[PDB]
């Protein structure tokens, strides 16, 4: 979908890779229900997105059951410095209790390895990140 500009479907290049491209012609975006998530960028832009797989990134890490997958493992291809928020689909537990908001560990991959950034803030069903979204 496309938030402020009305119905514009995200371009898919092939079903078997699950790649989703768009060009934003507008400042600002709205939550996509098909992705269940939202990134906001304040100008016209190309972005490519992947929903790849968590298994070939986390079975390569040993205490993987000292974590659980709680999201889609986004891959993003945009120019650096211009994305100003990404919202990842958090799965809620704060409606109940016994969950800390501070010890949360966002997974920023590189070919180096897993990085565990500290997220800026957690929503009910998303989290917001800072501008260097790689």
């Amino acid at each position: 979908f496309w938030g402020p500009t009305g119905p514009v479907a995200t371009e898919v290049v092939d079903k078997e890779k699950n790649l989703y491209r768009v060009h934003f012609p507008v400042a600002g975006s709205y939550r996509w229900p098909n992705t269940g998530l939202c990134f906001v960028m304040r100008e016209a832009v190309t972005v490519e997105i992947e929903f790849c797989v968590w298994d070939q990134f986390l079975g390569e890490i040993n205490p993987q059951h000292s974590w659980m997958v709680a999201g889609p493992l986004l891959d993003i291809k945009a120019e650096p410095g211009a994305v100003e928020a990404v919202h990842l689909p958090h799965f809620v537990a704060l409606q109940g209790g016994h969950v800390d908001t501070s010890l949360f560990q966002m997974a920023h991959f590189k070919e180096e390895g897993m990085l565990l950034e500290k997220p800026a803030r957690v929503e009910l069903h998303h989290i917001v990140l800072e501008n260097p979204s790689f």
Partner: protein, 846 residues
């Protein structure tokens, strides 16, 4: 006293107890991890790439079962305050490192029993830096690969190249020649071979094993560490490459020496122990040196060979010392360790005598070894040919009144500065009572020897006097030497990195000090944990695999960083993490450490597992788990879940589990360890009993009327000593694998913590529990004897003779055999039976 205030354990069915053990198993699999080990740092030397190093190590990814060679990429720059968890990239492409269902050769399974390697896969590998060569043994066949030397690094995994051979049998113990990485060496049929990777040419070097018949009739081996050396002195190789290449210069050729230990085990007692193939009903002979019997006749020897630029072993030559080894070195029973000085000038060796109160380090220069031929005129000829000046230098001589623990720390410096007078580092426990490093400078003053005539050495014959012995550490703590710990000596910054117990006896911390002056001892690890560390050869960054009594083991990668002018105060900053801390299971309660003081006012440490769902007021049945013997410390601030989950299972059924290290347990110095000297088995139980009465007073849930004492090796021996000498306190005794007669156990252990039976008759009669069987209880179901039938360390004879003397004294028992397990119950099904039998026995009769 009060049956309304004595906790009753719920009597589960046998299938219930299995259900409990399986629920431990499911959680247990996640808890066990087989942490990465055998780290090898290699720089990337690029200054424009992303990765600063490549760390190579052994590990199991968990995708598969067998542990394999892997690597991580250590970057030049971490993003700060966001931890880097390393990718575990595979060198090899998911092949079987072991054959189907764990079948090995009998000598491979024996070597894995001596090293206690329970894990499957590439257990050990060898590495050569400059060539980037990884030589390892997979599926009883040597393999190799190369990663980033004169070649480049990789990002995909490769195929491990197999090494083709004409030799029939396993090729054990492979080592790359450090001087020439194209050449390597291995043991085949207890004889030393040498090969060359790219051309495939192999070549035997020793001829001590005729391969004619059984080992009762073919007794000479070469390059093989024998039984007592493998299982009590923690040495598994018996050959050491010379690290440098010398040139004898015929026209262009290049010599390559190897020091090896020839062993003639003919005059040592042979015992038969049942083979794993029970259907065949045959045994295996084992040259097992019983206490008091004579040890193998040992000797050091040089197997040299000479090669060319085309890469062929042209010449070869066995060499042996100018006099026989036993005569040139009287009072030398065991070669504890050996190797070479890094320049290649001398081959060193730690000798040790039969009382084990007299250890001495010796340097053997290669010219002392003449060729070996049966022609006695060629022998005299080269006895004339060896120079008068050259000499073995007994450099260091430790003498003690308790026993010598073998400390493998020995760092000989290069001595080209001041061209004599070797300066080395050496751990010395006998001097002050605690294992401390020293810098020692001896003076190699040769007096001149005629090696053709045979002389008798004196008592301080080759002993060089000491120039100086500066003490780099001191205190009431020790520097860790044994059990494969080591030091790391940066000679450029002139620092020595060691491990020690300086902060507390319960924790192993990495310390650094300078060997110019003992200024201060800088700790490089966080307190409250215990650390197993491993440095880069460039001394810029290390790994530490560490844990605590509460937290599981993690493996963090630290980076030494600071102003280079002050290397001693370089701050270790956490760079990245390799294997982060696992999940403790929800039923797992981490145990409580305590300490207390005896009537002699010595401080003993102990653990306790509290009963889960503890009810105040209620008194509980107490399992005193025990080892209590030397060279093992049960109580330390370290994760007791991956190896002592059974203790938690007991706790989860409601048993108090108490663990005490009484006097004898190591990492607390020689005077502490030496309270069992010639009365081993006798003093430990008083320390364990006093630990019960203290824990009974401190915590109010210890029922003295229901005490079980469970042990497995020396612990099972003590559990039986507990039931004999303290019958009113210990209700039952689950004695696994017990050492029931000391006179039957092997030399290396017994001859060291007691001595030869002619010397200590009262100590042997009071310590062999099978000779004290009349004092066991007349009541039934108070004694459960467990034993692995195919045992080679604590032979089945021990349990058999105990049961024999129980029969003769008319005393009941119970007994459980594990017909296929050597010394640890290895197979998980057999281990599950062991645990359900332990729970059942406690449930019913405690």
């Amino acid at each position: 006293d009060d049956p309304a205030a004595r906790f009753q354990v719920q009597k589960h069915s046998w299938d219930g107890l299995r259900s409990i053990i399986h629920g431990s198993r499911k959680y247990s699999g996640l808890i066990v991890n087989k942490a990465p080990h055998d780290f090898q740092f290699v720089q990337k030397t690029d200054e424009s790439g992303p990765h600063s190093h490549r760390l190579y190590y052994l590990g199991m990814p968990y995708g598969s079962r067998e542990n394999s060679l892997l690597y991580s990429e250590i970057p030049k720059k971490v993003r700060k305050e966001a931890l880097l968890l390393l990718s575990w990239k595979q060198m090899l492409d998911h092949f079987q490192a072991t054959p189907h269902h764990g079948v090995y050769s009998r000598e491979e399974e024996l070597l894995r029993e001596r090293k206690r390697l329970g894990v499957f896969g590439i257990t050990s590998y060898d590495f050569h830096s400059e060539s980037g060569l990884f030589l390892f043994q997979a599926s009883n066949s040597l393999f190799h690969c190369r990663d980033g030397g004169k070649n480049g690094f990789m990002v995909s995994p490769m195929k491990p190249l197999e090494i083709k051979t004409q030799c029939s049998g396993p090729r054990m113990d492979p080592k790359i020649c450090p001087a020439d990485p194209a050449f390597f060496s291995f043991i085949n049929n207890s004889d030393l071979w040498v090969a060359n990777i790219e051309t495939g040419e192999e070549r035997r070097l020793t001829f001590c094993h005729q391969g004619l018949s059984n080992v009762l009739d073919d007794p000479k081996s070469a390059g093989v560490a024998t039984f007592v050396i493998q299982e009590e002195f923690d040495r598994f190789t018996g050959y050491w490459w010379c690290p440098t290449a010398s040139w004898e210069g015929s026209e262009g050729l290049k010599t390559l020496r190897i020091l090896y230990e020839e062993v003639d085990e003919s005059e040592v007692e042979v015992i038969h122990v049942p083979s794993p193939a029970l259907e065949e009903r045959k045994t295996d002979s084992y040259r097992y040196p019983r206490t008091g019997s004579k040890n193998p006749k040992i000797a050091l020897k040089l197997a040299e060979f000479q090669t060319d630029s085309q890469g062929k072993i042209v010449s070869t030559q066995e060499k042996e010392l100018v006099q026989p080894f036993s005569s040139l070195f009287p009072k030398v029973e065991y070669i504890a360790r050996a190797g070479w000085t890094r320049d290649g000038k001398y081959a060193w060796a730690m000798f040790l005598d039969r009382p084990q109160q007299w250890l001495q380090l010796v340097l053997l220069p290669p010219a002392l070894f003449i060729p070996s031929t049966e022609n006695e005129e060629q022998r005299l000829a080269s006895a004339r040919a060896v120079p008068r000046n050259v000499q073995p230098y007994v450099v260091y001589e430790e003498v003690t009144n308790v026993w010598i623990n073998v400390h493998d720390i020995f760092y000989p410096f290069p001595q080209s500065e001041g061209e004599d007078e070797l300066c080395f580092l050496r751990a010395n426990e006998c001097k002050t009572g605690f294992c401390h490093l020293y810098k020692v400078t001896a003076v190699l003053k040769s007096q001149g020897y005629d090696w053709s005539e045979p002389f008798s050495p004196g008592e301080d014959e080759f002993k060089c006097p000491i120039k100086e012995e500066i003490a780099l550490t001191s205190g009431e703590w020790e520097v860790l030497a044994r059990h494969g710990s080591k030091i790391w000596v940066n000679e450029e910054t002139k620092l020595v990195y060691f491990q020690g117990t300086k902060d507390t006896p319960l924790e192993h911390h990495l310390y650094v000090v300078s060997y110019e002056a003992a200024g201060e001892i800088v700790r490089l690890t966080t307190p409250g944990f215990s650390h197993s560390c491993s440095m880069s050869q460039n001394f810029d960054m290390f790994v530490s695999h560490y844990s605590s009594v509460s937290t599981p083991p993690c493996v963090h990668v630290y980076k030494l960083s600071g102003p280079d002018d002050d290397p001693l105060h370089k701050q270790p900053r956490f760079w990245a993490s390799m294997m982060e801390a696992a999940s403790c299971p929800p039923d797992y309660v981490p145990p409580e450490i305590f300490h207390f003081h005896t009537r002699s006012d010595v401080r003993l440490y102990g653990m306790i597992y509290k009963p889960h769902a503890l009810q105040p007021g209620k008194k509980h049945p107490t399992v005193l788990f025990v080892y209590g013997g030397p060279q093992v410390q049960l109580v330390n601030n370290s994760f007791k879940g991956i190896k002592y989950l059974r203790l938690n299972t007991l706790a989860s059924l409601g048993y108090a589990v108490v663990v005490i290290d009484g006097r004898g347990s190591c990492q607390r110095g020689l005077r502490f360890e030496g309270a069992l000297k010639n009365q081993m088995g006798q003093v430990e139980i008083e320390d364990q009993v006093e630990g019960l009465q203290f824990v009974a007073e401190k915590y109010g849930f210890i029922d003295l009327s229901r005490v079980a004492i469970h042990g497995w090796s020396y612990g099972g021996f003590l559990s039986l000593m507990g039931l004999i000498h303290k019958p009113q306190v210990f209700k039952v005794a689950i004695a696994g694998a017990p050492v029931t007669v000391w006179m039957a156990y092997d030399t290396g252990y017994t001859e060291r913590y007691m001595d030869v039976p002619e010397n200590n008759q009262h100590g042997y009669e009071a310590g062999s529990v099978a000779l004290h069987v009349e004092k066991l209880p007349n009541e039934p179901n108070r004694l459960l004897i467990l034993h692995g039938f195919l045992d080679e360390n604590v032979h089945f004879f021990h349990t058999n003779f105990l049961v024999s003397q129980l029969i003769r004294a008319g005393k009941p028992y119970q007994l459980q055999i594990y017909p296929n397990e050597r010394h640890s119950i290895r197979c998980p099904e057999s281990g599950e039976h062991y645990e359900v039998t332990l729970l059942h026995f406690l449930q019913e009769y405690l």
